């Protein structure tokens, strides 16, 4: 009795209703819904007898609440309106309603995802269309998009807004459709800055250092960007003290003791002031008593601490937002 | 250019890729030669790059992926030749 | 007894397939909305 | 009642369902699955009556949970979509889904095996394709692969990442397929470095010494690599003391006493400081009292100790990672 | 008695071969998934 998703239940219904049956079901379904459905059956698991019984019983209990004997809305409306108001009036008003729904759906869809994606999507566009698309979106998402352009382009766009003089609806719905098709690109960005920084972070010390030296020789600014994205392990010297204590609430004492053997003396001095007094005294005594440790073990402990920092930052507890910013 | 085959071969930068074509009804063979520079640029643009970091040719034979890209551009060149 | 259990389960599945097919012939948009609601429930 | 594997049960079902039946079963099976199946019956043991009864009863109890009346997913989806969205749309979207699954399966498969194998597989490739394949793999596996290339190639690859400008999906799925076919090479590497070192270790002392002298005459660097891989028996002088005590917790007293007769006096002095005081005194007294021992017996005991060290290192308790590295 | 035991075992084997053959004729993908799951169970 594996838990069955709505995709599984829908596939069970679809491959049982029929061929033209499933086709006419998709005739009343969005293109992306047809995509999600088609992605399912060609790698689905073959269903069970009791699984199909349960999913079709759920379909029955949903059909009890879903029974209307309905006819296709678009063609029904067209057939009624062609005689209610005439062919030309029916056509014009149906197209008006369709365009209104298109622009509303585009605005809603665009006010849903991460900012930089739409920012780079609209970066190449003409600044006037950028301006109108920006303002007709949600104000929060509009601000998120605006905070990512360059000085000249952003300034020109806002001047366009300040000197704005009205915009047509039909061409704007067409623009939303065009940018939707532009979103429909089977494309994977593969950002070679953040991923590169993470890879160099996962490197060992000698490897990452040689790699950093090579990239500094090739282009020093790119090396600086990579290191400003990755921070390595030594960035604990510039990590805030409260965050260090938050880490110390989870890090393990022997792992920290082993890691601190290879750490810089200034880093150790900064780190020992963060935990409790008795814990710091215990750590200092352990460092004094413990002899030399293998550099491989020290590197492994440091990498484990870095991974812990990374997951605690993913949780949002950590604040490593490109240094200690500005004190006010 | 009109030149003897030996002169053309000497002027041809070794190493490079060469490919033979049969052109019915004429008896003979065509000798289309693709340079490491163009195959390099094509593979760099296809796989993602800027070309600011060119690499020399060290006599290593072309990889299978490079040969496949060569065939991809070769069929296009042959179709343009024919039309 | 297991064979008879499976046989009656299959017969019930076939007759319920009959009724779902006739109901969707009456209205396939009901099936479309059921699928859309299942898609909506999928993401939480 | 020999325990029957899933391969055995699958063969039991397959050679009983039929010829076209088994063929149509493989039509819904991966190529490597067909390989594992075909490897079985041509050297399988003939089935028992109760064995086949039990495996087919297990098949029945699995079929109780597996009862769907399903149709082939790919052709069913094609036949539905050709009328749902049109022939061209159905073809294009089916190919998009197939390519997405191909690249996902390639990425998952490549993030599963030992690093150096994929490292040597991709060493000959062009550095740009190396870079893109590297970053689309798992970050841990990507780091493992990157830590094995040479300075120039690795530096160029990371420069490609730092200057990355995006990679197409379709040609990349094709590249994953091509490297999968490259993996499908019936080749046995058998490095003549590690195996050679182990063989020379298993040699007797005179044989291994003459062999080492010969390889040093031919190419001294290869001799140094072999000895740095094999360590012989005398490497206990450079073995860490904690590991020596761990070994002493398992080695046998009389075997150690016999072996130490032929050992170097510095090696004996280092070794006697590792065990307990009373054990060391007992060993010294036994060495003093015991007379000369046969060199063959001493060599046999030393080889047994070496084998014990090798198995305890295979278990991971022993740390012989190319010497005593760096003390920090 | 052993002969009759073997005879009835063989007859049961043949009839269950009949039912497995008809079930796999109904759906061979079930057999493919059973084989794949057996392969998955093999490696642990």
Swiss-Prot record, chains A, D:
The keyword S-adenosyl-L-methionine does not apply. Gene3D superfamilies: 1.10.220.30. Keywords: Bacterial flagellum, Cell inner membrane, Cell membrane, Chemotaxis, Flagellar rotation, Membrane. It is found in: Cell inner membrane; Bacterial flagellum basal body. One of its GO terms (molecular function) is cytoskeletal motor activity. The record marks 160 as: Part of the EHPQR-motif. A motif (Part of the EHPQR-motif) lies at residues 125-128. SUPFAM superfamilies: FliG. One of its GO terms (cellular component) is bacterial-type flagellum basal body. InterPro entries: Flg_Motor_Flig, Flg_Motor_Flig_C, FliG_a-hlx, FliG_M, FliG_N. It is a peripheral membrane protein. It comes from the Bacteria. The keyword Cell inner membrane applies. GO terms for biological process: bacterial-type flagellum-dependent cell motility; chemotaxis. NCBIfam families: fliG. Belongs to the FliG family. PANTHER family: FLAGELLAR MOTOR SWITCH PROTEIN FLIG. FliG is one of three proteins (FliG, FliN, FliM) that forms the rotor-mounted switch complex (C ring), located at the base of the basal body. This complex interacts with the CheY and CheZ chemotaxis proteins, in addition to contacting components of the motor that determine the direction of flagellar rotation. This is Flagellar motor switch protein FliG. It comes from Salmonella typhimurium (strain LT2 / SGSC1412 / ATCC 700720). The gene is fliG.
From Swiss-Prot, chain B:
It is found in: Cell inner membrane; Bacterial flagellum basal body. Disulfide bonds: none annotated. Belongs to the FliM family. FliM is one of three proteins (FliG, FliN, FliM) that forms the rotor-mounted switch complex (C ring), located at the base of the basal body. This complex interacts with the CheY and CheZ chemotaxis proteins, in addition to contacting components of the motor that determine the direction of flagellar rotation. This is Flagellar motor switch protein FliM.
UniProtKB/Swiss-Prot annotation, chains C, E:
It is found in: Cell inner membrane; Bacterial flagellum basal body. Induction: Inhibited in nutrient-poor medium. The M ring may be actively involved in energy transduction. Belongs to the FliF family. The basal body constitutes a major portion of the flagellar organelle and consists of four rings (L,P,S, and M) mounted on a central rod. The M ring is integral to the inner membrane of the cell and may be connected to the flagellar rod via the S ring. The S (supramembrane ring) lies just distal to the M ring. The L and P rings lie in the outer membrane and the periplasmic space, respectively. This is Flagellar M-ring protein. It comes from Salmonella typhimurium (strain LT2 / SGSC1412 / ATCC 700720).
């Amino acid at each position: 009795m594996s838990n069955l998703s709505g995709t599984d239940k829908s596939v069970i219904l679809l491959m049982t209703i029929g061929e033209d049956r499933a086709a006419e079901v998709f005739k009343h379904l969005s293109t992306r819904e047809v995509q999600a459905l088609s992605t399912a059956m060609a790698n689905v698991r073959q269903i069970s007898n009791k699984q199909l019984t349960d999913v079709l019983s759920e379909f029955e209990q949903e059909a009890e609440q879903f029974a209307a004997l309905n006819i296709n809305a678009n063609e029904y409306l067209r057939s009624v309106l062609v005689k209610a108001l005439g062919e030309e009036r029916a056509s014009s008003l149906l197209e008006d309603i369709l365009e209104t729904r298109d622009t509303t759906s585009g605005i809603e869809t665009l006010n849903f995802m991460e900012p930089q994606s739409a920012a780079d999507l609209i970066r190449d566009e003409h600044p006037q269309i950028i301006a109108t698309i920006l303002v007709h979106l949600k104000r929060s998402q509009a601000a998120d998009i605006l905070a990512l352009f360059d000085e000249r382009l952003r300034h020109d766009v806002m001047l366009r807004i300040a000197t704005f003089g009205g915009v047509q609806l039909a061409e704007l719905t067409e623009v939303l459709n065009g940018l939707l098709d532009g979103q429909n690109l089977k494309r994977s960005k593969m950002g070679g800055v953040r991923t590169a920084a993470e890879i160099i972070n996962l490197m060992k010390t000698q490897q990452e250092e040689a790699v950093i030296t090579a990239v500094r020789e090739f282009d020093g600014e790119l090396a600086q960007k990579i290191i400003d994205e990755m921070f390595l392990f030594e960035n604990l010297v510039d990590v805030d003290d409260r965050s260090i204590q938050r880490l110390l609430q989870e890090v393990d004492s022997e792992s920290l003791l082993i890691a601190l053997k290879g750490a810089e003396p200034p880093l150790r001095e900064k780190f020992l002031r963060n935990m409790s007094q008795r814990a710091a005294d215990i750590l200092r005594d352990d460092l004094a008593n413990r002899g030399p440790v293998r550099l491989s073990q020290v590197e492994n402990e440091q990498k484990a601490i870095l991974l812990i920092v990374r997951r605690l930052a993913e949780t949002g507890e950590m604040v490593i937002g490109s240094g200690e910013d500005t004190y006010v | 250019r009109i030149q003897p085959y030996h002169e053309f071969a000497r002027n041809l930068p070794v190493p490079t890729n060469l490919n033979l074509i049969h052109l019915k009804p004429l008896r003979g063979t065509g000798l289309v030669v693709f340079s490491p520079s163009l195959v390099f640029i094509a593979v760099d643009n296809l796989f993602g790059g800027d070309g600011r970091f060119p690499t020399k040719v060290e006599g290593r034979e072309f990889t299978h992926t490079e040969q496949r890209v060569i065939n991809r551009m070769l069929k296009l060149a042959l179709e343009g030749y024919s039309d | 007894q297991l064979q008879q259990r499976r046989a009656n389960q299959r017969l019930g599945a076939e007759v319920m397939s009959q009724r779902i097919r006739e109901m969707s012939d009456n209205d396939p948009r009901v099936v479309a909305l059921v699928i859309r609601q299942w898609m909506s429930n999928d993401h939480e």
